[PDB]
Ligand binder design. Structure first.
Ligand SMILES: Cc1nc2cnc(Nc3ccnc(OCC(C)(C)S(C)(=O)=O)n3)cc2n1C(C)C
Length: 303
């Protein structure tokens, strides 16, 4: 009912340069880039999305619905659209998340991921999701692959191509009745937590997608990760109840994981936890790994 007064920024092709390919899939190609506005003495590191095949009117429509959703959000734990460039194909300008997706991040850096990071990431994902809930936006595709890493200490939720099939992250009402709610996103959040807690394991590995519905109906759920106390596992289990209303709310998940983040070694048991470290601005050459006048999108022309 409330008018959507979000601003759609049209950016000139000449103002940004593609540096390298970051990812390539069904979505098309994502490039690492630099955005150098008009004459503002700033360089903004950006991620540029462009579709791999054709210049079809159907492709342009799909990318513009994604732009509408990404331009309508504003939260530290959600990815916002910076702007669009109206080339023949039309491309999305987004914030560069230098450390990639959280799924690949936990797989590649498992030996240095301590309980503090895991629990803080759970808080951040719940904050983003609670924001999406307050904006009445149902994600429908929450997974560790869709959580991006700005810094190891700061993650954001992305992928709004489904926001208003990934069966192994879907709630029961979603598979059987196509019912999607903020409570069906809670189930997905449970699987995302499981992914993190197992340092990037594949949920129901080897089991075909058509067998998931039957498995869930029998009462089978993902197993207790070896680092998880019954406290952390019980939360995951509550996200996977049949009754959507019995599942935790995102605001409760923020509270529960925050309490745990205060004494993380009491809730996750990780061998050599205290001797583990990940990059932070404290690191020599943290930003180093044209570097003059560069500023992050979060500090530039704030909405
Ligand atoms: C490997 C990698 N490095 C990245 C650095 N920065 C971003 N920036 C952003 C910001 C918001 N949204 C996204 O992309 C999410 C996708 C892939 C779902 S998209 C481009 O289709 O919207 N990337 C994305 C990056 N990736 C992708 C392709 C997962």
């Amino acid at each position: 009912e409330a008018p959507n007064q979000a601003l759609l920024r049209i950016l000139k092709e000449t103002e940004f340069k593609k540096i390298k390919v970051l990812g390539s899939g069904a979505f098309g190609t994502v490039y690492k880039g630099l955005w150098i506005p008009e004459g503002e003495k700033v360089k903004i590191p950006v991620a540029i999305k462009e579709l791999r095949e054709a210049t079809s009117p159907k492709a342009n429509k799909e990318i513009l619905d994604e732009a509408y959703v990404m331009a309508s959000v504003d939260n530290p734990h959600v990815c916002r659209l910076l702007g669009i460039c109206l080339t023949s194909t039309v491309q999305l300008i987004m914030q560069l998340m230098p450390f990639g997706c959280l799924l690949d991040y936990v797989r590649e850096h498992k030996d240095n991921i301590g309980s503090q990071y895991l629990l803080n990431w759970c808080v951040q994902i719940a904050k983003g999701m609670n924001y999406l809930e307050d904006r009445r936006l149902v994600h429908r595709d929450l997974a560790a692959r869709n959580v991006l890493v700005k810094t190891p200490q700061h993650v954001k939720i992305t992928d709004f191509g489904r926001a208003k099939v990934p069966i192994k992250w879907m709630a029961l009402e979603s598979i059987l009745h196509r019912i999607y709610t903020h409570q069906s996103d809670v189930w997905s959040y449970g699987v995302t937590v499981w992914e993190l807690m197992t340092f990037g394991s594949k949920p129901y590995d080897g089991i075909p997608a058509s067998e998931i519905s039957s498995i869930l109906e029998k009462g089978e759920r993902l197993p207790q990760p070896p680092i998880c106390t019954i406290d952390v596992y019980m939360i995951m289990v509550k996200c996977w109840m049949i009754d959507a209303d019995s599942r935790p709310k995102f605001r409760e998940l923020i509270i529960e994981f925050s309490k745990m983040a205060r004494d993380p070694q009491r809730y996750l048991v990780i061998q050599g936890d205290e001797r583990m470290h990940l990059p932070s601005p404290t690191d020599s050459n943290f930003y180093r790994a044209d570097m003059d006048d560069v500023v992050d999108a979060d500090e530039y022309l704030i909405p």
